[PDB]
Amino acid sequence: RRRRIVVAMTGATGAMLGIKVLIALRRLNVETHLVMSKWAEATIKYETDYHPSNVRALADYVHNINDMAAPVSSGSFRADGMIVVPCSMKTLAAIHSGFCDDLISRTADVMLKERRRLVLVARETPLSEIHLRNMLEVTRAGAVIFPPVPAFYIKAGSIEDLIDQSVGRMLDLFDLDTGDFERWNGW
Amino acid sequence: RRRRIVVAMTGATGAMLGIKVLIALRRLNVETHLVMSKWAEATIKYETDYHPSNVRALADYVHNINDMAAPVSSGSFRADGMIVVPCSMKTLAAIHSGFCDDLISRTADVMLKERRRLVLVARETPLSEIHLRNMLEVTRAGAVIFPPVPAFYIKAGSIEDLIDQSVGRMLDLFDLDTGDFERWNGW
Amino acid sequence: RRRRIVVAMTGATGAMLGIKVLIALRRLNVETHLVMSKWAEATIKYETDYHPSNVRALADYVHNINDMAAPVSSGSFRADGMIVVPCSMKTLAAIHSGFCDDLISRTADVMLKERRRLVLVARETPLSEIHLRNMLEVTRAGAVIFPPVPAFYIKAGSIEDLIDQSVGRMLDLFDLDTGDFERWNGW
Amino acid sequence: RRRRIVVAMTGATGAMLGIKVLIALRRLNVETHLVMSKWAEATIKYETDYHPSNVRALADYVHNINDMAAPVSSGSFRADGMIVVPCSMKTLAAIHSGFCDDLISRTADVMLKERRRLVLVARETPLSEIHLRNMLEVTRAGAVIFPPVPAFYIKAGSIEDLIDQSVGRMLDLFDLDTGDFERWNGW
Amino acid sequence: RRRRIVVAMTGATGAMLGIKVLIALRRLNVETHLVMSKWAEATIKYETDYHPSNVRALADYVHNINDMAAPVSSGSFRADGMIVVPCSMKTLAAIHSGFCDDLISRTADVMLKERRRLVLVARETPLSEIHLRNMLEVTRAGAVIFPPVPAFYIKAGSIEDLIDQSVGRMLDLFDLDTGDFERWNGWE
Amino acid sequence: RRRRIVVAMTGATGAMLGIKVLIALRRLNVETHLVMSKWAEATIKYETDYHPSNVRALADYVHNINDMAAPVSSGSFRADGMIVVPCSMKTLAAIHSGFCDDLISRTADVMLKERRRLVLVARETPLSEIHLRNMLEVTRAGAVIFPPVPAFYIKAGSIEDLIDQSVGRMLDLFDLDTGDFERWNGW
Amino acid sequence: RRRRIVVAMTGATGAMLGIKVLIALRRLNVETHLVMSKWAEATIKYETDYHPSNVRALADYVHNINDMAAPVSSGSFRADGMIVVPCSMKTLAAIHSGFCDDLISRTADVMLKERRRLVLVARETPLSEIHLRNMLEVTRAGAVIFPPVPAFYIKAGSIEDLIDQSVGRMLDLFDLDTGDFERWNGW
Amino acid sequence: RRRRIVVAMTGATGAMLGIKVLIALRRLNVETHLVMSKWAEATIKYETDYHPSNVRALADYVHNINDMAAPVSSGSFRADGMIVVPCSMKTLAAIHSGFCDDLISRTADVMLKERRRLVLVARETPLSEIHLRNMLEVTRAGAVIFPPVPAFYIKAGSIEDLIDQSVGRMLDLFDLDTGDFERWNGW
Ligand SMILES: Cc1cc2nc3c(=O)[nH]c(=O)nc-3n(C[C@H](O)[C@H](O)[C@H](O)COP(=O)(O)O)c2cc1C
Ligand SMILES: Cc1cc2nc3c(=O)[nH]c(=O)nc-3n(C[C@H](O)[C@H](O)[C@H](O)COP(=O)(O)O)c2cc1C
Ligand SMILES: Cc1cc2nc3c(=O)[nH]c(=O)nc-3n(C[C@H](O)[C@H](O)[C@H](O)COP(=O)(O)O)c2cc1C
Ligand SMILES: Cc1cc2nc3c(=O)[nH]c(=O)nc-3n(C[C@H](O)[C@H](O)[C@H](O)COP(=O)(O)O)c2cc1C
Ligand SMILES: Cc1cc2nc3c(=O)[nH]c(=O)nc-3n(C[C@H](O)[C@H](O)[C@H](O)COP(=O)(O)O)c2cc1C
Ligand SMILES: Cc1cc2nc3c(=O)[nH]c(=O)nc-3n(C[C@H](O)[C@H](O)[C@H](O)COP(=O)(O)O)c2cc1C
Ligand SMILES: Cc1cc2nc3c(=O)[nH]c(=O)nc-3n(C[C@H](O)[C@H](O)[C@H](O)COP(=O)(O)O)c2cc1C
Ligand SMILES: Cc1cc2nc3c(=O)[nH]c(=O)nc-3n(C[C@H](O)[C@H](O)[C@H](O)COP(=O)(O)O)c2cc1C
Ligand code: DMA
Ligand code: DMA
Ligand code: DMA
Ligand code: DMA
Ligand code: DMA
Ligand code: DMA
Ligand code: DMA
Ligand code: DMA
């Protein structure tokens, strides 16, 4: 019935990106399935005013990071995509290597084998050859690398305006239209 | 005598990153050599309150984008590094491919052959396999890929605070200390 | 203004190598930051007369293996080098793959992206194609593989004499001279 | 009816490893064929109390390094394996490249084409990309790389104890049990 | 306390390039360690008015090509870099393959493993796929390929002027300024 | 009925090499088709006594650098080979990449697809990994890389002697004998 | 005026192939330049009735294996091709690696760079991955691998009949027709 | 109880090699399973005095080339190895590509997956890059390439003497000793 998208958050800086993804997906009437890593919860508390319990309330369903029996861990579970936002280099490497020992990496591993859209908001700078090799080869395996670089051409008035443009551009990859930002139409 | 760094700006969004790099380098008593692409001047006018003539005044020397006889185009010219900020995918590809048909790509080509530090603030999202292949292989050739992703863990109060942290992290790669941002020291 | 070097120990045999690196680095007035793996602590207990607390007293600062918020885990933290001594195949693989899920592998991951010297005293024999592929490719990413093979040409009288020579050659890679071993100068 | 093993010594430090291999193999009733390089003889004289004449007496047969007509140089010659101990980087590269211009490299070249066990006690530190590429690719061709790294977990009392453990683990690869060292069996 | 640079000469044409490197480094108070191959000595005799004994006098220390126990053959030996000038395809291949069976190739092999600057003035034309593969892959291992192609834009009045510029550009890679050639500064 | 050879000059130093190639080819009764890049004309003026109009007078036919409709730009046009002398790194990369947006790179692109001899006098030092990758891979596509390195073994009396020898060796690749230099015949 | 072909013999079994190549080329009015390795001379003596001096008399010119100043060692020397018959794995590896430390490997190295026909009668069985890697990659560099495998379909009456057929097929690669063997034209 | 070896003959010249393999294996008390391709039967008739029915009588079991249900086509069937003698380039390519559309290529495909010894007496000269790519990559997959090149150093008196030596060296790869040829033991 309703479209399903798995939203995974990891311990890279940029926790507000994952929070605003859940808000935008809820408004778009998308059934969300949230998984938060241990260090994702730590960065949520430290960088934002949200508590992990507040972020869990923004999602239709929540699954435990270590619960490999969760419904989303099986390819038979029907879902239409997954976004890891923000995505740490550790989780990027787990997905690239195939070492799927938690629910985030396993569900991403499953999305790739089932040929479902997987978007990794990989946040790190500068990049080593390890990071770039992982990005290139996971891209060839089917994933989409979305570095959250600001779009300064929108003449933003606040940090939130840039984050809203980024979140809207992320969800474009699932053929979803937030209508929350100004798309380019020339000068 | 004074350290020399070539500062190149291209037509990717984020012109304020290159402007604040020139300001920080001037304060650090670094002799700067500025080159601006045609579309870099266009994005400076459109996203910022600066005019190209204002940015040129922030640099000790300015060289024309099409002047292949400029001093910085020769490896015999002594310089200590180059940063392309912001760096478009087009200029990243010119450097990766070796098609050095303007002063920015030629000077970058020269920095790589002379084994001088070259930093590319490559701004694009999402990334295709073309972008990532260019990033990986130019990295193996010696360049440093620095995607300008914000560091939200600093609890920034403004867009300028995030840009200042990014610029300071860029210049760390030249062993320069702005002292303009708060470095991580735990929670 | 002292030089900072991260000393990481893992659960490969040869715990005395890491202990003597700390002792050396202290005598040369280097500020050492020690991280010990869980199995490093076990190997320290089993094959040396030291206790992990004795090892911690040899370092200027100690960080917990699971504390991903430690200062050394960020590239903004300035450091001059990192040595993993001894380095197990497990940790070598974590660094090669990029699966940086503890402080040793994350700090090493940061050293590579910030282009700082990383020395892996990788101890294992014989070597599989997995080990050698990881060594070769992590070398291309910037790390130095240092197998702790004895230099019998020094005509040592004890195991400790051979360890001292190995430790001295390790620290040569950071441009540090222990002056504790006979450098080669003909027969 | 006796098993034949070619024992080759090259000019890497650690000549005692090859001497003890000859002693251990004689104990095990293996017919040994010794080949010593020119710089192996110099190394034997420098760092051991053995003269090359003493080492030749430890072997059943001795062949000249320059004698490409020696029996071991033909694949039609029955042999069960070969160990280069210690193995220099030069000889590792001769075997990797295929430039078989002396009896050691040619016999190793023959062992690989006849699909016989070839162990290279490659001793060098630190390792360059050249060394590791040669190790990885000669491994894929069928060779076993055995860095002589000490097993400190045996809680040794002398340098000789650690050499004995290494020699025993080397000969494990030929399915031989010296019985002179303590194998791991838990704490 | 002085900087040490190993200067290796091989049997590629261009022996004067190595001779002028030794002279320039002496001028810069660099302690030079010279190794000459067998065919480098033949090339010196044929192409120059120097005898190998004259070239050896230009260096602070000279090591035998066959002496694998020379000080420079160990990584424990302190040194800031090595330049092979001129560098034959044979020696380029020895370094690329790792077949380090003489003092020049072994010392270069050691420079690469110790992460020290290694410059190969590789002289050959035209180039085969063998040469180019060796150049590309040894570059990735850390070496610098410096083909001695003349910089005609200096408007030289003699062969020696072009050689002096090449030698100065070589030593730039060791952060050394001979001050004996005109660096580019736009159109004169 | 005469052989046709395209002579292309680019903005690398060494303009006299291309001028002498034209003179040598004229003496050998070869119909030459000249294309000069914009920066080739500037280098001709700067480092030689020739004017570009003098160089055009040495050729049988001259085509404009931006005229993609020139006869030599089509494979249907009969031609026996092409030499780019001197060849910049920029034009080397244009040919390697296939970005054939001027008459020199397009004609070279055509020579490769029609399996005609293409000689690139690629002049640059030192060489980066970008340059060498382009040289290796364009060689595999069919091109011949000819770095203009002097042949001191001819015991030359002037710069012109060494240039004459290089030019003669260049034209050897087209099975042409200038007879203007001394070929090697032993000591 | 006459065609020049370098004939190189190495220390693989099959010296009679090289001798019969020299006889066939003399009959075809080809100027032959012979180079014999040290182990080719030993092989000639052992498995043929020829003395090396008899083989030298079959050639128009002879050059010493260690004479790097011989005429054929330079690309400036006019020559139409080279055949190494028989070709050892050692010499195959010297050519593949580029380690051209004798006149045979240097002349072959020169033939490849000058784009002249090079035929390697590589004789070894079985083949290792080293041998096949060298064969494949030297082929891509321009060489032709000619294993001297007998053509039994000619219905030979002696060993010499099969040798004559191999020699004729070898020289087919130089566009030469010995005319002393029966080519295939159906049953 | 008895050793089983699959003997496959294909349509390359050298049918007598396959016949003599069958005779040698019968003498060695090895249970042989013969498969002949269509063009091997034509080759047997043309260059030997045997009829295909005579060759079938030399084997213990015979299977039809198109019978994909034969016992040897399954990995569950116990067998100790397989030799394809002689091996055409077509069959070499079928095994390399995996296009196992007859019993010879499928049985070889099975031998590789079950990790059993597979020897390909690949006969062709000269070799293309296609042939050598197939040889190299099928070798890495487990097969042994055995070019039937004669060993002239045995000082043979007839064609059959050289064939007997090749056959004995072939079966050396199955740890079998025909004992009817002189192995090398010096001059
Ligand atoms: C405050 C803080 C910020 C961090 N930011 C990043 C980051 O931007 N990128 C990254 O790759 N890792 C970052 N890390 C490190 C990761 O949290 C660490 O590698 C962790 O093991 C990743 O775990 P996870 O992917 O399972 O959530 C940060 C850590 C902390 C404590
Ligand atoms: C307003 C604007 C913003 C742009 N932002 C980017 C960008 O973020 N990344 C990118 O690769 N190209 C961007 N482009 C496109 C580049 O300007 C374009 O590819 C141009 O050819 C690059 O030229 P240059 O690198 O020589 O300056 C942008 C263009 C415009 C007009
Ligand atoms: C006594 C002992 C000795 C060990 N020696 C080695 C070794 O030499 N090399 C290795 O790769 N692993 C060795 N291991 C196994 C590692 O401890 C194990 O793989 C562990 O997962 C490594 O974890 P760490 O790198 O986080 O310390 C040893 C284990 C024990 C108990
Ligand atoms: C005293 C001494 C110790 C050496 N130790 C090593 C070593 O440990 N590893 C290495 O690759 N080369 C070492 N070498 C250099 C080799 O001996 C040199 O490369 C030589 O050419 C190897 O030749 P071979 O393999 O034929 O014996 C050493 C040389 C000397 C004089
Ligand atoms: C006069 C002369 C000039 C030579 N020039 C070159 C050259 O320019 N490039 C090259 O690769 N080899 C050249 N050689 C060949 C090398 O000397 C030969 O390959 C030798 O084996 C190299 O040995 P080395 O590198 O140890 O000195 C030349 C030889 C001679 C006699
Ligand atoms: C005086 C001068 C000398 C130059 N020499 C070289 C050179 O030797 N090699 C090179 O790659 N570029 C050299 N360049 C830079 C090229 O001219 C520049 O990259 C240009 O874009 C090449 O354009 P073209 O290949 O279309 O002629 C030189 C430039 C100048 C002004
Ligand atoms: C009698 C005899 C036969 C040989 N046959 C071969 C052979 O068929 N293939 C091979 O690669 N090496 C063979 N060799 C070994 C080579 O002679 C040896 O590797 C030598 O180093 C090659 O040197 P060269 O290529 O410079 O002549 C044989 C050696 C001897 C003594
Ligand atoms: C008389 C004759 C001799 C042949 N010799 C060879 C040969 O030596 N090598 C080869 O690859 N093909 C040779 N062929 C071609 C093969 O028979 C042909 O490619 C066939 O398709 C192979 O089929 P098979 O491998 O299934 O037997 C020969 C063909 C004929 C008629
Ligand atoms: C947790 C669980 C039962 C996973 C199995 O589903 P899958 O994605 O591995 O595919 P399949 O339905 O074939 O088992
Ligand atoms: C613009 C110009 C004259 C470039 C030449 O310098 P380079 O970097 O190509 O090196 P070199 O000094 O050897 O010519
Ligand atoms: C604990 C912590 C702050 C980790 C992030 O380090 P970083 O190097 O990724 O920081 P940045 O790239 O934003 O400078
Ligand atoms: C001394 C000698 C005979 C060397 C050739 O060995 P080989 O393995 O090539 O012999 P063959 O392949 O002929 O059995
Ligand atoms: C001549 C000689 C003794 C060389 C050893 O140098 P090395 O670098 O291989 O030894 P180590 O690594 O122990 O310093
Ligand atoms: C100026 C022009 C006609 C270019 C097309 O040449 P082409 O070789 O691509 O065309 P064709 O394949 O028909 O020769
Ligand atoms: C003995 C000798 C002169 C060797 C040089 O040959 P080469 O082909 O390398 O010289 P060049 O490239 O100048 O023609
Ligand atoms: C004719 C037949 C039964 C073929 C199956 O062989 P297999 O080795 O593919 O079967 P399995 O894997 O079940 O042993």
Author numbering:
A (entry chain B), B (entry chain B), C (entry chain D), D (entry chain F), F (entry chain C), G (entry chain E), ...: 39 to 225
E (entry chain A): 39 to 226
What did the paper state?
In order to understand the DMAP versus DMAPP preference and any mechanistic consequences, we here determine the crystal structure of the DMAPP-specific Aspergillus niger UbiX (AnUbiX; also called PadA1). We determined the crystal structure of AnUbiX to determine the structural basis of DMAPP versus DMAP specificity. Although AnUbiX was crystallised without any exogenous addition of DMAPP, the crystal structure reveals electron density directly located above the oxidised FMN that corresponds to a bound DMAPP. While the majority of the active-site residues responsible for DMAP(P) binding are conserved in AnUbiX/PaUbiX, a significant variation occurs at position 181 (PaUbiX numbering). In PaUbiX, F181 appears to block binding of a beta-phosphate containing DMAPP in PaUbiX. In comparison, a Gln residue is present in AnUbiX at this position (Q203), establishing a hydrogen bond interaction with the DMAPP beta-phosphate. The crystal structure of the DMAPP-specific AnUbiX reveals a similar interaction between E162 and the DMAPP alpha-phosphate is established, as part of a highly conserved network of polar interaction. We also reveal that the N5 alkylation process occurs when using DMAP in the DMAPP-specific AnUbiX, and is thus independent of the presence of the DMAPP beta-phosphate. However, in this case we show the ensuing Friedel–Crafts alkylation of the flavin C6 only occurs when using DMAPP.
